[PDB]
Amino acid sequence: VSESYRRRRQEWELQYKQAEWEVNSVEQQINLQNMQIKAANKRLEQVEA
Amino acid sequence: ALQVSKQSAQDRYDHFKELYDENISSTEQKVI
C-alpha cells in the first residue's frame, strides 16, 4: 500500500505544473490586445485629421 | 509567448519518458 500515496500525489503535482505553464502562456493575450488597442486608438488620427 | 508551448510539451515529454521508461528496483519491487 505505501506506493498508493506517491501515485495519487504525482497526478496532482503534474497538473499543478500544467497550471504553471498555462498561466505563463496566457500573457500573450494581454500584450497582444494592449498593442491592438493602442494602435487602433492612434488610427483615429487618420480620420480626424 | 508561444515559447510556453515548448515549455509545456518538453516538460510533458520529459515527465512521461522518465515515468514509464526504464522503471526499476525494490522501491516498487519490495513486496514480490
UniProtKB/Swiss-Prot annotation, chain A:
Phenotype seen when the gene is deleted: Cells with a disrupted yenA1-yenA2-chi2-yenB-yenC1-yenC2 locus are no longer pathogenic in C.zealandica larvae.
Coiled-coil regions listed: 2-49
PTM statement from Swiss-Prot or TrEMBL: The isolated toxin complex includes 3 peptides starting between residues 768 and 778 of this protein, which might be physiologically relevant.
Compartments it resides in: Secreted
Subunit structure of this chain's protein: Semipurified toxin complex consists of at least YenA1-YenA2-YenB-YenC1-YenC2-Chi1-Chi2. The Yen-TC:K9 subcomplex is about 26 nm tall and 22 nm in diameter with 5-fold symmetry and 5 copies of YenA1, YenA2, Chi1 and Chi2; the chitinase subunits may be solvent accessible on the exterior the complex. The Yen-TC:K9 subcomplex has no insecticidal activity. The native complex with additional YenB, YenC1 and YenC2 subunits is 16 nm taller and is insecticidal; the toxicity-conferring subunits are present at about 1 copy each.
Cited function: Part of an orally active toxin complex (TC) with strong insecticidal effects on larvae of the Coleoptera Costelytra zealandica, Acrossidius tasmania and Adoryphorus couloni and some Lepidoptera larvae. The TC has an endochitinase activity.
Protein's name in the database: Toxin subunit YenA2
Organism of origin: Yersinia entomophaga
Gene giving rise to this polypeptide: yenA2
